[PDB]
Write a protein that binds this ligand. Sequence first.
Ligand SMILES: Nc1ncnc2c1ncn2[C@@H]1O[C@H](COP(=O)(O)OP(=O)(O)OP(=O)(O)O)[C@@H](O)[C@H]1O
Ligand SMILES: Nc1ncnc2c1ncn2[C@@H]1O[C@H](COP(=O)(O)OP(=O)(O)O)[C@@H](O)[C@H]1O
Ligand SMILES: [Mg+2]
Ligand SMILES: [Mg+2]
Lengths: 370, 370, 345, 146
Amino acid sequence: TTALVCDNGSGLVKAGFAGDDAPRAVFPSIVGRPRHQGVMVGMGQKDSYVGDEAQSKRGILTLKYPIEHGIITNWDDMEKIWHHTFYNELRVAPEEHPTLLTEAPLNPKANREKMTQIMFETFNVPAMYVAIQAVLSLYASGRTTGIVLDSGDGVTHNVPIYEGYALPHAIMRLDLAGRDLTDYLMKILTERGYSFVTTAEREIVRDIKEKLCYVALDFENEMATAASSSSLEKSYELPDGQVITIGNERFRCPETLFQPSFIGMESAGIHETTYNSIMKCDIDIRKDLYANNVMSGGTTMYPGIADRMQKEITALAPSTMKIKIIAPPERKYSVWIGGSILASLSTFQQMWITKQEYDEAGPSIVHRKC
Amino acid sequence: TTALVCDNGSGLVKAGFAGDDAPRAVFPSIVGRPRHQGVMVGMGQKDSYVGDEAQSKRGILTLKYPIEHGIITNWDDMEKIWHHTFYNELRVAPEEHPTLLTEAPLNPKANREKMTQIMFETFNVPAMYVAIQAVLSLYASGRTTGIVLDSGDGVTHNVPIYEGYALPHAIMRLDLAGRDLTDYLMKILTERGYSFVTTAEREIVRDIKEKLCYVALDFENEMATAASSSSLEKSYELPDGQVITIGNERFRCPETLFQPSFIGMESAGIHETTYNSIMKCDIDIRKDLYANNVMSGGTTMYPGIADRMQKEITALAPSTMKIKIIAPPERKYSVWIGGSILASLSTFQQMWITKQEYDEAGPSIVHRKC
Amino acid sequence: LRMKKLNWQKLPSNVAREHNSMWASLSSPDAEAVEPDFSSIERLFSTFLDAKKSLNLNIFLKQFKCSNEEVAAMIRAGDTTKFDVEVLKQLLKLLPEKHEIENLRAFAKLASADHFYLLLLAIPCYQLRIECMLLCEGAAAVLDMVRPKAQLVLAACESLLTSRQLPIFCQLILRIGNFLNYGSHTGDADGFKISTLLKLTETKSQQNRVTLLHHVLEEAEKSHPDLLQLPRDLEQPSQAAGINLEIIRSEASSNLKKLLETERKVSASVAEVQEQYTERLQASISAFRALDELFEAIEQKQRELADYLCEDAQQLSLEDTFSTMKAFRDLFLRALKENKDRKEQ
Amino acid sequence: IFCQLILRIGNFLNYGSHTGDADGFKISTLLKLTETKSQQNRVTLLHHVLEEAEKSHPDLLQLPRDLEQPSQAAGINLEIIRSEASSNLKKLLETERKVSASVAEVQEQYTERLQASISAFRALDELFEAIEQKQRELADYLCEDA
Ligand SMILES: Nc1ncnc2c1ncn2[C@@H]1O[C@H](COP(=O)(O)OP(=O)(O)OP(=O)(O)O)[C@@H](O)[C@H]1O
Ligand SMILES: Nc1ncnc2c1ncn2[C@@H]1O[C@H](COP(=O)(O)OP(=O)(O)O)[C@@H](O)[C@H]1O
Ligand SMILES: [Mg+2]
Ligand SMILES: [Mg+2]
């Protein structure tokens, strides 16, 4: 029996099969319910539009994310998403396929037990394992020692890894992530006259950011340049045919990642956060970490971010130090790619959490083998 | 005339007048500045707020410590604190008012000259003396020969003293102090869900450790105690009215002093530091020094700490050797108390740098006459 | 009248003028000389003891919060209201030296540190006075702590001598051990040392989790009065572990030797000392007699115990039995929980 | 010009004390020039000497133009740049013997590659000796101990 991999993200759910190059089913992790009145009758109506179905009909639905800041709260919504993946997107039987799941570090201990409990009872999987997001991200690159900047949708965390094992005392975490950058975009879009309030219009602002946003190399010069000439302005067409124009709002949105004071946060940017995580490690291994910055996650794809981080890290590290940042093109699915690689290896066998062991310690055995 | 005694610490500043028993003015050693925009114009506004004024308004300020690990880093910020203490808290003109100062052990040579020029020129102090934190700590305990475990907010120290002079070859140092202890509590507090990622939110987590955290005699026994029953749980109310509950995290925060591998440090515990610092002395003195372990600083005010280390030192020390842990009830302000005693001595007036004496030799004169 | 002083690292006047030094050129009109505004610069920037002994004495006198005259009366009168065991030790070290007495005798104007010495000098035989109450108070805190140790070790030996399960338990392993080691150098031995029971868990079974101690406990579980009443009899020897009798015996003898030595000095003093401290010293002398007498009973009791185990003398040094027996009992309790856990699961 | 002016001014301020009347001072003195404060408490000795130096712009104000190269040179220690060049050279020579003893199939492609890198570092370490000679004059220029 082949294994299964399902990277439960905050914004997107990427699941497939072990050994595959790409996920078989990636869909947003949103569950929507109707808010208007069902005047029409005699027609097939549902109240549990989840994932891709809810995205298409978002005009008549309220879109809610079951996962906020990487922590699952709506546990009845997560059961729907897991049931949607196992039976609709993949069309597989959970009781005959071992499963692998991915969970962010520095997560509440209560999250792990509940996730194990659902899968071993509601779905009755034969085997299950939980692995760290940043550990699987480095396995995609083929390495086993490096420092991973994983800016997902809900949380930005930095996990230095050495010889295949994480360093729990040097992990830094920043709550500013991709979703918080979307909300800051709507805040400054009202400056020019465009108002987006609905959760249906929240997705529109997300797609504006995914296309017209880039990281400026020099903020002071790029702000002076934008005010000097209209050469930086682009245009976007709304689903109703309306067109909007944004000038210096293009790079001011992802700049918050490096100046978190824009949205009121106090912690330093990702460039200073990564630097601080290096000094928490031993001085004899900082040579192996300063040259293996492997970005991952969707939020790390603003054009110019790789150049910007190299420039900022250089001004912090000693001049003689060598700084090399690896930015793989497939960093969106890096966390899943490492999981697909790991599950196929025969060494990962004899490490499963089988049914005969889960009942020995209940949902607390997930902490025994993680 | 009277002589002022001013103790400059990493966390608190304790000052007052010589001859008394308790410090007149003890306040945190912070200098905060606004991070927002001042909309109103009628009210009086100030560039910076010093002392407990900044602590009260800490919701809209970032708090910066002028002293890190005992050494004075921000020399312009520490000139504000001394001005605040002399003119606002004590409200006494430093002119015609000789003062006394306490300096950390192994103080850098440059810092000693810098302070002498600051007080003699700016404040026009007729006389001044500089002492050592560990030397004054043993005076306040009614002794003259012993080993002091001066564990403050910045740095933990073990300074064996013999007849009023420290032993520089046997002086140890451990960077496991109160500030590092509260930063470890924040990391493990997220295991239950609660998150504190702000400097202003560090003071909130400081008071949780001060009130609820204690030391367990047997780590394994307390580990099994918390798992067996929830009797260890305690409830604390945040300033905004929320309630938080902590179980086994109560005794795992001060345990890092004895198992420094928890925080990532590769050094040994405080129990081994005293044992290591005692083998650098003479064999005959070791019998005398073993029965004069004197506590100091605020970081040692934990329930069952004067007994836990006695159990630990018993294992390291030989069976014939005797151990006497001295933990005076007022050990929080021991350093200042010794300074008050020293300044009141009739024969102590010969060790004062007169104003006319300073007119011949500059700030380099502090190394002499001391 | 006065100028702000700026501190610089002054260079020697013979080195700064060398040819390689740049200051040599400035000393001669070889560069463009510039003159500052001198008018504005002035209006804009305008005891006999050593310290080791004298200071330590004042610090010693600052834990009483009384005058120097008052503290002299307490020493003369021998009052111990504010004087403790540790305080006396510091006073013993802080005593007049050979040079200190000569300077004072050769001699208000003198500092308060030497003022207490002058008052202390007037006190007759001040050296003897401090030693009198140091030993008496110290002896009071010694007898009440050695005595429970002496009773505990004596009780442990009697219980160990009168134990019933050890003859049954040591026979079962001996019978088993002969079967296990039949046909080799080991086995068929009449007896073994007491340290054998400490290595019982080293014999693993096929399951690798059940040891020889676990198996003999499984068959002993059927007969609860047999081999399971043993830990009830091992409580007293277990507590005696870590309490060596050599230190407690030396401490009693050392204090008595010092107390007896000072007894002659006290007897040579005036009658005032005798009528209110001499009877205190002899009271402690008689009290310690019962302490050392019980030690002989312990030595007699352990002599039978040393021959009880059929082990060579000077090899069964009391503390060896206490440490080994406590560890053996500790391992016994752990095996019982595992055996009970095995039965239920 | 600058070091002479502070020496002239410093002698005036320290007249009649142990300090003063000195023929020179260490280079670290200028780092403590701004610590002295005047009556205003915001105008230091550095500020005052600049006020009179502002009258003569070519004097004492062209200095920061000459200090850009030494300023950029800070933070680059020579104890790691010299060790790194020597450490790589030692490894190259040790492996040079190994490849030479190997089959000629490796020598025709890799032996000549190593010799190219070995010869390149020769000019690198030669410049290091030039720096050592240059800094020796500078050390005696400031009259500071070796
Ligand atoms: N009851 C308590 N329990 C635990 N920690 C405490 C308690 N009271 C105070 N502390 C700790 O004491 C620290 C500061 O105390 P202290 O007065 O020794 O510091 P300090 O004077 O700044 O030190 P230093 O001389 O090292 O600079 C606080 O940061 C706090 O963590
Ligand atoms: N080209 C892009 N430019 C900027 N942001 C992007 C881009 N593509 C995706 N994102 C951001 O990535 C986020 C989710 O990506 P992903 O890392 O897969 O989420 P998760 O890891 O939480 O599943 C979205 O919120 C989106 O804002
Ligand atoms: Mg992810
Ligand atoms: Mg202190």
